Amino acid sequence: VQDLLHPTAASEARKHKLKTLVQGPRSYFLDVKCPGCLNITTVFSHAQTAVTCESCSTILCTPTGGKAKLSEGTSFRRK
Amino acid sequence: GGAKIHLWDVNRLKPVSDLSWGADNITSLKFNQNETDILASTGSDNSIVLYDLRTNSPTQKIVQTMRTNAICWNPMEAFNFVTANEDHNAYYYDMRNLSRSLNVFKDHVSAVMDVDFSPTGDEIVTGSYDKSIRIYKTNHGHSREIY
Amino acid sequence: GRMHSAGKGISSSAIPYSRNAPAWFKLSSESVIEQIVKYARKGLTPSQIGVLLRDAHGVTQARVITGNKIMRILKSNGLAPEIPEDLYYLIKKAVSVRKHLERNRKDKDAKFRLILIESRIHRLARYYRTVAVLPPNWKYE
Amino acid sequence: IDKKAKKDFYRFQVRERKKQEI
Amino acid sequence: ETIIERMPIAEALVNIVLGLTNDDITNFLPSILTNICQVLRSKSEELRDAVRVTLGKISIILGAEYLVFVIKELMATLKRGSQIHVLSYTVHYILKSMHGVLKHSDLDTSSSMIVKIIMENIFGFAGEEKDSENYHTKVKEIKSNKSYDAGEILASNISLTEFGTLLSPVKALLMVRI
Amino acid sequence: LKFLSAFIRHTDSTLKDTALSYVLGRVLPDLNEPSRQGLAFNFLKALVSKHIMLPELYDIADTTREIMVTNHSKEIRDVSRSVYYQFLMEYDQSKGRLEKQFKFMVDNLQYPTESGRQSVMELINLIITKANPALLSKLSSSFFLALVNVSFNDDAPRCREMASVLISTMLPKLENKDLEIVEKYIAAWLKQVDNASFLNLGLRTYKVYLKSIGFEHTIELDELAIKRIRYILSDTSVGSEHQWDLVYSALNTFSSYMEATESVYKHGFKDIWDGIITCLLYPHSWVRQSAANLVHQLIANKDKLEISLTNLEIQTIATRILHQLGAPSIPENLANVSIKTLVNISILWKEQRTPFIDYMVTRIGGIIRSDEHRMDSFMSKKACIQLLALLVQVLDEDEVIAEGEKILLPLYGYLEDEEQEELRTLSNECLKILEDKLQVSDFTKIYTAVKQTVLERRKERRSKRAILAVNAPQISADKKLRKHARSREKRKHEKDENGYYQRRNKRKRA
Amino acid sequence: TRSSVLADALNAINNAEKTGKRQVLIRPSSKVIIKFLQVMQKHGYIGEFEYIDDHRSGKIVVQLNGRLNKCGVISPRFNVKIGDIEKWTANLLPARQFGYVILTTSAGIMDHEEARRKHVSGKILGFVY
Amino acid sequence: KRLDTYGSGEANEYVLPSAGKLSLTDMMNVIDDRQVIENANLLKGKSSTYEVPLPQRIQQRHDRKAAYEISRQEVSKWND
Amino acid sequence: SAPQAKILSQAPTELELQVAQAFVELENSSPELKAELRPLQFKSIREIDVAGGKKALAIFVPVPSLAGFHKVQTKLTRELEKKFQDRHVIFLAERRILPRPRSRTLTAVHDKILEDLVFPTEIVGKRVRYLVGGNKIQKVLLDSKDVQQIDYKLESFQAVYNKLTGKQIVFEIPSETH
Amino acid sequence: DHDIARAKERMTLKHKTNSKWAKDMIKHGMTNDAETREEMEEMLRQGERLKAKML
RNA sequence: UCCAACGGGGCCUUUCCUUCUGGCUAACCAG
Ligand SMILES: [Mg+2]
Ligand SMILES: [Zn+2]
């Protein structure tokens, strides 16, 4: 037994994105700092493209099946 | 207790005082039997609110994972009350410390709809949506009987 | 609930409840419109434009950020497709399959898929003719 | 971006192709 | 296209007729007043407001002795749906317009008709339709309730002996559950 | 409670103190939601009025004084102020308590909310208006400094005006020793020439000092103000570092000084008067307005001067007042004051012919015909057109005929959008005055001269473009292209930072 | 595919009542669903229900107390005269005054008794008893 | 340099900006007498201005908590 | 800068003048925030009461400038609330409604006003509870970004929304027991 | 702290005023009802409590 | 003089510019 109207926050965190009471994305955005250049670029967590630093054309992330893998040496922060 | 919990006097046709924590409605309420100025209510938001008439104000509020259907105060311990809950359980509470329960009664297989103390205060009886009545000793977490 | 298949997948995007731009987004709406125009001029489709903006510029949704869809923004600037994007890709997939069938006439599987693809073009081509998006005389190949 | 670009998607692109056709 | 502009012609007709002999007045006034009240059947709100102002001015020119004729004519022409709400809005407007000219006990003759309109539009079926959330309309006669104001106009004019006309429907309402 | 109040107020019988103590026990807790306790306040007013002595009434006084300053409803503050004031003035209290009560009032004068400060000043005013001289003497110095603070620096203009009014009604009632402390502070603030802020404080407080105790009560303080005024007005040039606030303050206090005494018209004060004439064109508009008012009294009282204004100086003033009108944006009040001065100067020139009004008329016409700052020039044009109507009335019949062409020429275009409509209506009024002043024949002779002059020049200009085209078609074409380029720039619609679309020429600046 | 969301809501409520569930979740919601549930609530068949907005068709959570014997939709929504109402109440309800037939009339969605009282008619939405 | 219109309106002395902002302490200290200062006895001491009232829901929250402490004391009498 | 510059209305009210004065004072005090405070300017002010007794300042602003106003809102609002204590400051964009405006546009602009009100926090959700008797409770669920601030302003938000839209709404912050 | 202290001063004040003994005080009035010894003792207590507040 | 209800009258929520559809060549006919 569970309260459908008032579900526990932990219980909702376990559910599928579309199966919650109000459905919304589980993705997010990051502030990724370039290694060689130190400029900050906004990157989507599940980015489907190899995001490049505009100043350097330096690869920041690599697309994968789900979340994009951030290039080693690139610092990040959740935006 | 309806959309708002109201206090009435027999000799007045409009409610004498308006008690309410907020906008949420009140599903049940039970006066205390010894400290007669203390009142408890149940809300549709799975909450238990305590009131005191001497201050004409609500005092404490705790929210539970599921709704509580009935409340009964212990006729022999003014600070103890039991709650009939929708998670198959009845919970025994101390008024002064509501962060935990004194005991849990665990035998029903459907929502517990009503609960009552024996006037000696040593037993409680619970009615359930599963078509049974169970009797518990206040000190033990399983029923001694099912009717 | 796939058409032309037995698949029952439900994978999709989940639009957030909030319709407003993120508080952390601090870029002018005019600069986003200009970026959409440059990408379209290089020849990207509206779907691919949204991917680049969302992946590299923080544009969660163009409508949420600018107030207008990418489709409507480009048309305001003279950039519009000859045929709708979804119909465009269906025709190209039919062309690649038909080209493959010219060399490989024993590929009965590819012969089967071309029937499914072409039937998907007729259903979509029929729809656009009703809404007047496509001229009434338009017929596929 | 270059590999993802379409030569014939926009009306101006087909017009440009129409221009060189004649 | 010109109906709103021509309505005040009815006010001109009442003036010239009232100068005639009494036999002619009885022969021309009922035709003139009846014809105005039929324009209230119109589904145009702007035309219905143009009719209403002309009825108000004619009511001043006439006395309260003609008020009973007008109200009974109004009840005959407006009988179904939104027409019921137009009836009470127009009845209040005539009473509101005639507020200065009216003398004490002028509304005694028409008191019974007014209270039936007032009570029906507060507690009757018309009153319920005004309170219905499902009832989406832009007509101002229906969204606006003027029964309370009409009750104040009436109580200022009624002779105290007939003041039981107002209280009786109240008592009948109070006997039933409320 | 309302009935209980009327029971006590009127009926001879009264309730027990024990019964009264219980009721006040019920009222005190509920009293912190005063919005629905109005009738209870009337009950409390009854108890203090009969001076019934209860211990709980002293707690009521402590609660009801804070409600006076914190509550938002005006009615509750009004009734809570009355009950508190009567309690303070009537009920027995220890001297230690009284100082604390008055300590509360001074500190509450710095309450954040403006309505709170205004309510306090009602209570301050009650003490000032009705209190023992001994009590006022104890509290004169404290109120003055606290009130002067609010008047000097406060967000609410109403509070500053109220603070000045309280000081104005407070100083006359002070004892000589108490007033003598006030004189030190105003003197001390003026002495602080190093700090500009202290100067504004001294100059503004000196204004309140006049009209309350008057001029010449203490000569030393008066002399300090003039030295500060002389020091400020002398350094009004570009190199000067004085702020527009300090210049405006000096002109305010001088204007009040000017009313107080006629010594301003002596030769000693001429240096200040020259500085005032300089400020007519000071960069700030408010300084111009205050300078304009001073010059108006100077011109109206030119006979009072020991050294009468030389006609050259009067004519220089007229040039500067005309230059004021030509400024981009001018208020209603500056325009009205300026034309009153120029009319007064015109009377002198008319009565005594000055060979250096025809000069005034041409300058007025120049302003009416100017196209600079079209978007904001309505007020300058209004003043000029109204000024001409006034000049016609003063000027003699023979004199207007000589200058009739100059008057009627600029207004002809108007005689042939609500702002434009207003200007055309004013011009018609001016023509009616000209018609009444003159006869039928002289008026029509002047009207024909302007009509032919305006119509002749238009057709003459139309020809010159034709000869310009024929002789130099290419240069005429070039001039034509520049004209269309200019129009397109003015015609274009542009958006503001707020997405507000307007045509280029509609854009308004000063 | 989905044809009647009201039918789905009523079927889900019936199954929840069948299996002894104290609450039921309905997706999608509608104006018609809310009016049907409000009639049910006014007649005491259901208790509190709460509407959840997701910027889409929506959801509803209904509290159940065991007081619903049956609810159903009548599809298609046949046109009903004033005279026909009796016939329908005869065909859908186990007894004469046991339960209500729910109609959508020109004056809104209401039970058949109120439709007679207001003298209105229209199409039939369903029944509850 | 440029003409400062300061809007298009009559000059008001009460709107005139003041000032570093001068506190009341600065004004009373300028006297430098120490016998005039003590006459302003009400102006020396801890600030006595009232705190602005809090929002009622926040006030009720503290009222509810205070009421709860009292009620616990009343029922703890039954403990013996 | 004069206060009249900040005010788009030709005839500013006294409250408008005071708040614009606070604006220009903040601009002058700031070394560099002025660079973004100066372009910003507002259309009007409305001081509206709250159930608790205090008041709220609704600052009506142009739609395009609302982005910059939002960019500076936290600092600007804290400064103004310091300047105007016992008053809650909120920035709302002024959105066109006239075609008698149509109901769908009213609903859209009311929603947008709600999102403007809740700022900086965001609306997690909305719910309607239908009680047995027929009452309806409309509830708006807010996120917990700045809970300590908005907790003091929830009643102000309710009062403002009721005053502007004429709807009763309850703001709740889930994940906390208030 | 000020508002927490202010809250405590209320519910103490309301709690005292609700006390049953306080209800006994209001049962008489009009300076005509019999003055009981307990009331006279309170009248003495009111005197010193009054003195404290003047000071 | 202020406040709260209830009644009236005038305004406002619309800066300026472009922008209905269909025939035939910015016109001209139709809706
Ligand atoms: Mg697929
Ligand atoms: Zn880089």
d(C-alpha F436, C-alpha C28), whole Å: 65
List phi, psi (to 5°) of I164: -80, -45
C44 and C74 in a single domain? The answer is: yes
Q: Which chain C residues are Cβ-neighbours of G54 within 8 angstroms?
A: 17
Edge-to-edge strand ranges of the sheet holding B143-146: B112-117, B123-128, B133-137, B143-146
Residue E16: exposure state from Cβ atoms within 10 A (0-12, 13-18, ≥19):
exposed
Chain H residue with CA closest to I24: the answer is H17
| Ligand nearest the Cα atom of residue C7 | 1
For the record, the structure tokens of F296 come out as 């108006």
In chain C, the number of structural domains is 2
Q: Which residues contact H14 (CB under 8 A, 6 or more apart)?
A: F157, F158, F160, F161, F164
Distance I80 CA to K12 C1' (A): 28
The helix/strand/coil state of B105 is strand
For the record, the structure tokens of F413 come out as 């275009």
Task: Provide the experimental method for this PDB entry.
Answer: cryo-EM
Instruction: Note the helical H segments in chain I.
Output: 3-6, 14-29, 34-37, 66-83, 103-118, 147-150, 154-165
Domain hosting C135: range is 81-141
Q: Which chain I residues are Cβ-neighbours of C23 within 8 angstroms?
A: 70, 120, 122
Q: What is the DSSP letter of F295?
A: H
Q: What is the largest CA-CA distance in chain B?
A: 46
Cα-to-chain-centroid distance, residue C22: 25
Measured distance between the N- and C-terminal CA atoms of chain A, rounded to whole angstroms: 37
Asked if C5 and C12 count as a contact pair (C-beta separation under 8 A), the reply is: no
Covered bases, chain K (protein CB within 7 Å)? 2-3, 6-8, 13-17
- According to DSSP, the residues that pair with I123 across neighbouring strands are I142
In chain I, the number of structural domains is 1
Burial F389-421 (b: 16+ CB within 10 A, else e): bbbbebbeeebbbebbebbbbbbbebeeeeeee
E93: the nucleotide nearest its CA (via C1') is K8
In a domain, residue C130? The reply is yes
List phi, psi (to 5°) of F49: -60, -45
Asked if F249 and F200 count as a contact pair (C-beta separation under 8 A), the reply is: yes
d(C-alpha G32, C-alpha G5), whole Å: 9
Positive/negative CA dihedral, B36, B42, B46, B49: negative
| Domains of chain G, CATH where assigned | 1-68 (3.30.1370.30), 69-129 (3.30.1490.10)
Q: What is the DSSP letter of I153?
A: T
In a domain, residue C12? The reply is no
List phi, psi (to 5°) of I21: -60, -40
Contact call for E and B: 3+ CB–CB distances under 8 Å: no
d(C-alpha G25, C-alpha G60), whole Å: 6
d(C-alpha I38, C-alpha I24), whole Å: 8
Q: Degrees (nearest 5) of the Cα angle I155, I64, C51?
A: 100
For the record, the structure tokens of E168 come out as 């009786």
| Ligand nearest the Cα atom of residue C86 | 1
Ramachandran quadrant class, C132 (left: phi over 0; alpha: psi -120 to 50; beta: rest) = left
C52 and C101 in a single domain? The answer is: no
Residue of C95, C10, C13, C92 whose CA lies nearest to C45:
C92
Resolution in A: 2.7
Q: What is the DSSP letter of F309?
A: P
d(C-alpha A40, C-alpha C24), whole Å: 13
User: How many angstroms does the Cα of residue C13 sit away from the middle of ligand 1?
Assistant: 14
User: Where is the domain boundary, C63, C80, C97?
Assistant: C80
d(C-alpha F346, C-alpha F128), whole Å: 50
Asked if E97 and E57 count as a contact pair (C-beta separation under 8 A), the reply is: yes
C100 and C129 in a single domain? The answer is: yes
d(C-alpha I129, C-alpha B24), whole Å: 9
Neighbours of I35 (CB within 10 A): 10
The helix/strand/coil state of F304 is coil
| Ligand nearest the Cα atom of residue C93 | 1
User: How many angstroms does the Cα of residue A41 sit away from the middle of ligand 2?
Assistant: 9
Which residue type occupies F310?
T
Edge-to-edge strand ranges of the sheet holding I55-62: I44-49, I55-62, I87-94
Distance F71 CA to K1 C1' (A): 20
For the record, the structure tokens of F436 come out as 């009444």
Asked if B124 and B117 count as a contact pair (C-beta separation under 8 A), the reply is: yes
Which of A12, A22, A78 best probes binding to I when mutated, by most I CB atoms within 10 angstroms?
Answer: A22
Which residue type occupies E89?
Y
C69 and C90 in a single domain? The answer is: no
Domain hosting A69: range is 1-79
Contact yes or no for A1 and B66 at CB 8 A: yes
Q: Quick check: F356 CB within 7 A of strand K?
A: no
Ramachandran quadrant class, F457 (left: phi over 0; alpha: psi -120 to 50; beta: rest) = alpha
**Crossing angle, helix F311-325 and helix F332-351, to 10 degrees?**
150
- According to DSSP, the residues that pair with A52 across neighbouring strands are A59
C36 and C71 in a single domain? The answer is: yes
Q: Which residues contact I46 (CB under 8 A, 6 or more apart)?
A: I57, I58, I60
CATH label of the domain that carries residue A63: 2.20.25.100
The helix/strand/coil state of I93 is strand
User: How many angstroms does the Cα of residue A52 sit away from the middle of ligand 2?
Assistant: 9
CA atoms within 13 A on the CB side of C56: 24
Distance I105 CA to K31 C1' (A): 29
d(C-alpha G49, C-alpha G41), whole Å: 9
d(C-alpha F429, C-alpha F36), whole Å: 60
Domain hosting I157: range is 3-175
Asked if I129 and I137 count as a contact pair (C-beta separation under 8 A), the reply is: yes
In a domain, residue C31? The reply is yes
Residue of F77, F69, F7, F66 whose CA lies nearest to F35:
F77
- DSSP string spanning E43-106? S-HHHHHHHHHHHHHHHHHS-GGGHHHHHHHHHHH--STHHHHHHHHHHHHHHHHTTTT--TTT
Distance F474 CA to K25 C1' (A): 38
In a domain, residue C19? The reply is no
Q: Quick check: F103 CB within 7 A of strand K?
A: no
Q: Quick check: E96 CB within 7 A of strand K?
A: yes
d(C-alpha F262, C-alpha F242), whole Å: 28
In a domain, residue C106? The reply is yes
Q: What is the helix, strand, coil percentage profile of chain C, to 5?
A: 55, 0, 45
Measured distance between the N- and C-terminal CA atoms of chain G, rounded to whole angstroms: 28
List phi, psi (to 5°) of B41: -135, 160
Q: What is the helix, strand, coil percentage profile of chain A, to 5?
A: 10, 25, 65
CA distances from E63 to E55, E56, E91 (A): 12, 11, 15
Q: Which residues contact C97 (CB under 8 A, 6 or more apart)?
A: C110, C113, C114, C117
Residue of I51, I67, I58, I49 whose CA lies nearest to I13:
I58
Q: Which chain G residues are Cβ-neighbours of A3 within 8 angstroms?
A: 23
Task: Count, in order, helices (H) and strands (E) of chain F.
Answer: 23, 2
In chain A, the number of structural domains is 1
d(C-alpha I137, C-alpha B24), whole Å: 8
Q: Quick check: I98 CB within 7 A of strand K?
A: yes
In a domain, residue C65? The reply is yes
